[PDB]
Amino acid sequence: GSSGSSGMKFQAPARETCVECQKTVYPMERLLANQQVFHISCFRCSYCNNKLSLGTYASLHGRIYCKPHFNQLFKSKGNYDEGFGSGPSSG
Ligand SMILES: [Zn+2]
Ligand SMILES: [Zn+2]
Numbered sequence: 001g002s003s004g005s006s007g008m009k010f011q012a013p014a015r016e017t018c019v020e021c022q023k024t025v026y027p028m029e030r031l032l033a034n035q036q037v038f039h040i041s042c043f044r045c046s047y048c049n050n051k052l053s054l055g056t057y058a059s060l061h062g063r064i065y066c067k068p069h070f071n072q073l074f075k076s077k078g079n080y081d082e083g084f085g086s087g088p089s090s091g
Helices: 067-073
Strands: 030-032 037-039
Touching: none
Parallel strands: none
Antiparallel strands: 030 037
16 A cells, blocks of 8 residues: 555646546636635525625635625634533543
């Protein structure tokens, strides 16, 4: 077992591909979004699945989202639990 690759890059072929439908994106429908090739059509919210543009969209961990949902989920206020915690241990 001898390899050395990790991550989405180095398109096998000699072109780009849609990170939504996984299809060969042409130079006519190539829409750059979050440093990734997206289809002017595919470009939608992974929550409601609505058409978006290079201004109303919002990506976080690779997935797209509409301002509404993006903020409705992302944005927030004072709210935390007493879960987190650390402690020493003999080593
Ligand atoms: Zn597509
Ligand atoms: Zn949405």
